[PDB]
Amino acid sequence: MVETEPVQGCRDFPPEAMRCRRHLFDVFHATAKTFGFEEYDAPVLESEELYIRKAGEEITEQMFNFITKGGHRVALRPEMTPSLARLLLGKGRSLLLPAKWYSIPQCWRYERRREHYQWNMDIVGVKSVSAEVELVCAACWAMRSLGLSSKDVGIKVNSRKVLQTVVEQAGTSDKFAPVCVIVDKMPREEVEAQLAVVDAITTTLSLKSIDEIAQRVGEEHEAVKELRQFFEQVEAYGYGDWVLFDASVVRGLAYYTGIVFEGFDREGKFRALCGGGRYDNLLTTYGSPTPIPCAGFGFGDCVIVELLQEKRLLPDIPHVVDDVVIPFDESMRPHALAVLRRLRDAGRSADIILDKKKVVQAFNYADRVGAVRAVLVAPEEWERGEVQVKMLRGFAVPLDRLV
Amino acid sequence: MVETEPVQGCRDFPPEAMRCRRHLFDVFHATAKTFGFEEYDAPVLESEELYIRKAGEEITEQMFNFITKGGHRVALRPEMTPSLARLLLGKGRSLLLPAKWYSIPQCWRYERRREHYQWNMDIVGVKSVSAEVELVCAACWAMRSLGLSSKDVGIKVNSRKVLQTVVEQAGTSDKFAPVCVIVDKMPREEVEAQLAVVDAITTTLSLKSIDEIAQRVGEEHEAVKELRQFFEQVEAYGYGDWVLFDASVVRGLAYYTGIVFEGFDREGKFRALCGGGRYDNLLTTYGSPTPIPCAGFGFGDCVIVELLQEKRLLPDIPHVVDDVVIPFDESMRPHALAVLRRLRDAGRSADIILDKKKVVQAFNYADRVGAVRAVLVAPEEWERGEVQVKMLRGFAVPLDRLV
Ligand SMILES: N[C@@H](Cc1c[nH]c[nH+]1)C(=O)O
Ligand SMILES: N[C@@H](Cc1c[nH]c[nH+]1)C(=O)O
Ligand SMILES: OCc1cccc(Br)n1
Ligand SMILES: OCc1cccc(Br)n1
Incomplete structure (x- = not known):
């Protein structure tokens, strides 16, 4: 008999399981439509080059790569954002802005699960925090559409500019992104050893509110005005019980420059439900002659299902x-x-x-x-x-x- | 600047192109729902073993394969049917029958396009030609839903049992499938050379109607009764102007045992729009203790779009x-x-x-x-x-x- 099990770390979706997935995806699609986002897609297969960021990211470390018969270094995509940027850069001047694009790609890794689907939502060409407001609201909207409430889940919100300022007011401005990647991992002894290759970092990570961080950098430091505006807009949209400040949130990705955020269950039982942030420099690093503001998030298909199962939803x-x-x-x-x-x-x-x-x-x-x-x-x-x-x-x- | 073009032989789908694809897929989905089929999915990545059929199929010859870091022979799937069978075999006795399953997988090849999406529709556990009737009608339904008529396209219908009988009445019963694969290629001089490693074959391929083939094998040879029933049912469903007999149609796949069929544009401008047939032995060859009748088709996303563009649809x-x-x-x-x-x-x-x-x-x-x-x-x-x-x-x- 043939091996009836799927390949290592990958999931089968017979009709029963597919109905569940389709229930989740219908929500991702319907939320995107509600929010005016446009669907796009790109090959699961991308040039390995695309992901060479050299910041020690877990997502790039665990890249499902191989060489073609023609000798070309390629990968099953570990995430979508680089593909989005390629597409954006390919269009350049012809793309009308702002643009709001979404997709639900399967993404991959090698090391546990080797694949997952990930709802991606991104706003392109919007400088202001209104982009982040809408993205965070879209994620809340999807969770609420799935039956969850603000008693079940929240979104933790921070800005990397604060740590940036503390990195700046302290000793280069060259390795802010590697530091984030390390601080994101917060085993204190282990994390500090990695940073050797600091006290203001831990202190500011542990600061408990906007007022306390305003004391450290001013009531108008870049990061303070944005967050107050952010929380004010989310408040005005009516999802104020869903969001909160958390200075320990930096995310694991090199390219975030501004507001970052993370979805979580209020019982402390699960990993992040979703994760996102502003990444205003990515397209500059891909060789864009003009800076292109961007912001977005990824929202996986696994953690949310566990949560929904636990809540009998x-x-x-x-x-x-x-x-x-x-x-x-x-x-x-x-x-x-x-x-x-x-x-x-x-x-x-x-x-x-x-x-x-x-x-x-x-x-x-x-x-x-x-x-x-x-x-x-x-x-x-x-x-x-x-x-x-x-x-x-x-x-x-x-x-x-x-x- | 980064390489903005997609990897070789793969397509980008920015919002404009994605709206077109989604227009096609909405039809595939809506036709499946109309016909009572259930959606399923499986990993794009499958064990290379799955496809080792040794019949010289073009689809297996052009397999996008590689070895993992762990040394496992794997492939991006060249088609879905083997994945379906694995899933069916995995369920065995627990799967209620008949079952009607569909999916729209991206499938791959290495050599031109290296990927396409392919609507798959399959009926499992139905002995009779009613399975093939419904499948052919589903394909016509999708084409009609896209704006095409029976003036624009048709479905050519045949049975491999005829050639089987001519292979049987002539000289083994071991290599009927390789012969089909060769005869499917019909450069006569080239095709005959391959068959060396015959005249009744060419003759029966050129027979122009059911009556003429009935003269060759009897008014009740297995294949004659099925086709008359098939055409009678399609006639009764009201899609009689869409279907016709063609004795030259065998398809390129080893595993078809019975009725086979192929969609085509009536101007002779394009390759097959879709292709399918009965494959009653596949699951036996995968090690199923009980024979499982199956029938289905694949319907690609490229040829149909060309046709729709040509027709201004x-x-x-x-x-x-x-x-x-x-x-x-x-x-x-x-x-x-x-x-x-x-x-x-x-x-x-x-x-x-x-x-x-x-x-x-x-x-x-x-x-x-x-x-x-x-x-x-x-x-x-x-x-x-x-x-x-x-x-x-x-x-x-x-x-x-x-x-
Ligand atoms: N690519 C990010 C999510 C994201 C989309 N846009 C911005 N960030 C991740 O995998 O976590
Ligand atoms: N796998 C076949 C189509 C098919 C589905 N079911 C039966 N046949 C092909 O690629 O042509
Ligand atoms: O971001 C983590 C990740 C990336 C790709 C696949 C899987 Br499963 N998990
Ligand atoms: O059946 C032909 C085929 C298989 C996989 C990918 C492409 Br494009 N074409």
Whole structure:
């Protein structure tokens, strides 16, 4: 027998599991539409070059790469943001701004799971914190659409500019991104050893509010005015109970320059539900002649499902279909087919019993596939221009009155 | 600057191109729902073993394979059917039958395009030709939903059992599948040379009707009764002008045992639009203790788009959004945000102008993103509990009357 299990660290999605995934994705799609984002996509396969950032990122360290037969260094994408930037840079001057683009790519890694799907939402060409406001609200919106509340989850919000200022007011301005990557890992003894290759860092990470950080850098330091505006806008949109300040949040990615944020469950049981931030320099580093402000987030398909399961928000939903058409016997098949065509022509989902079987087993089959209605096509009714209809969740009906 | 082009033989889908793809996929999905098929998925990455069929298939010859860091022979899937069978075999006795499963996987190759998406539709556990009838009708349905008619396209239909009988009545019963693979290629001189490593084959390929093939094997040879039933059922479903007999159609895949079929444009300008057939032995060869009848097709995303472009059936459709909310200035942002929340709460798609800009440039922006309506939020109206609304495809309105 063949190996029936999927390849290492990858998931199968038979119909039952696929209905769950599709329930999650319907939300990602519907939230994007609500928020005016436009869908895009790009090859899962990208040049390895794309991801050579040299900051010790976990995401790049764990890159699922290989060499083609032609000798080209390639990778299954570990994230989407670099692909987005390539696309943006490819368009350059022709792309109208601002742009709001989303996608739900499968992303990969090698080392546990080797794949996941990740909802990506990004705003391009918006300088102001309104971009981050909308992104954080979109993530809250999706979580709320899935049945969660602000009692279940929150979004922690910070700015890297603060640490930047503390890095700046202290000793280069060359390695702010590596430091973030290390500080993101916060085993204190281990983290400090990595930073050797500091006290103001730990202190400012532990500062508990905007007022306390305003004391450290001024009531108008770049980062203070943005956060107050951010919290003020989220407040005004009505999702104020969903967001809060947390100075320990920097994220693991090199390219964030400004506001960063992270979704979490309020019980402390799970990893981040989603993660994002402003990355105003990425496209400059890809060789863009003009700086392109950007901001966005990734929202994985696994952590959220665990949370939804824990909260009893992922009930199995069975397959449904409107009609199951049942030939009384094989002589009625042509006529049953004509009825099938009408039902489908009217926008109904409909099966016809494909195999040879007895009526009562056809009815049982109808029940098992979650049919709302069974339509029996029998000789005596057919000559009266009728079928027998029966609701499952039988009285004779004219063919025209079925739809 | 970074390489802005995608990796060799792969396609980018910026919003414009993605709208086209999504138009095609909406059809694939909606047809599957109409026909009662259930969605499933599986990893793009599969064990190379899965595809070792040793029949000289083009699809396996051109397999995008590699070795992992752990030394495991793997491949980006060249087709989906083997993945389906793995899943089916994994379930075995627990899977209720019949089952109707669909998916729209990206599939890959190495050699031109290295990737395409392919709608897959398969019926499992149905012995009779009704399976093939429904599959062929589903493909016609999708094409018709895309604007095509039976004047534009058809489906050629055959059975491999005929050639099987001619192979059987002639000299082993071990290499029927390799012969199909060669005969599928029909450069006559080249094809005959391959078959050396025959006249009844060419003759029967050139037979022009069911009556002529019935003369060669009997009015009830397995293949004759099935085809008459097939054409009779498709006729009864009302798609008789879409289908026809063609004895030269065998398809390139080793595993087809019965009825095979192929979609084509009636002008002779394009390759096959879709391709499928019955494959009643595949799961036996994977080690299933019980024979599992199966039938299905693949329907690519490229040929169909070319055809639709040629027929002027793929007009660009611009982005749309219901509302664009416009702060009169920054002081109105909080209030504009509250309005944004209401609109979205009511199921509308809505943007808010994120950047600082003048009203008339906001209105222009609204027009460019395809907004149905612009909602101006200005101080004088706001204190009257109102905004200014203006249709694009402005009169004052109470906040409650916007939805
Ligand atoms: N690529 C980021 C998410 C993101 C999208 N846009 C900005 N950030 C991640 O994987 O965490
Ligand atoms: N795998 C086939 C299509 C198919 C699906 N089911 C049966 N056949 C192909 O690539 O042509
Ligand atoms: O960002 C972590 C990550 C990247 C790719 C795949 C998986 Br699973 N996890
Ligand atoms: O069946 C031909 C095929 C397989 C995989 C990818 C592409 Br493009 N074409």
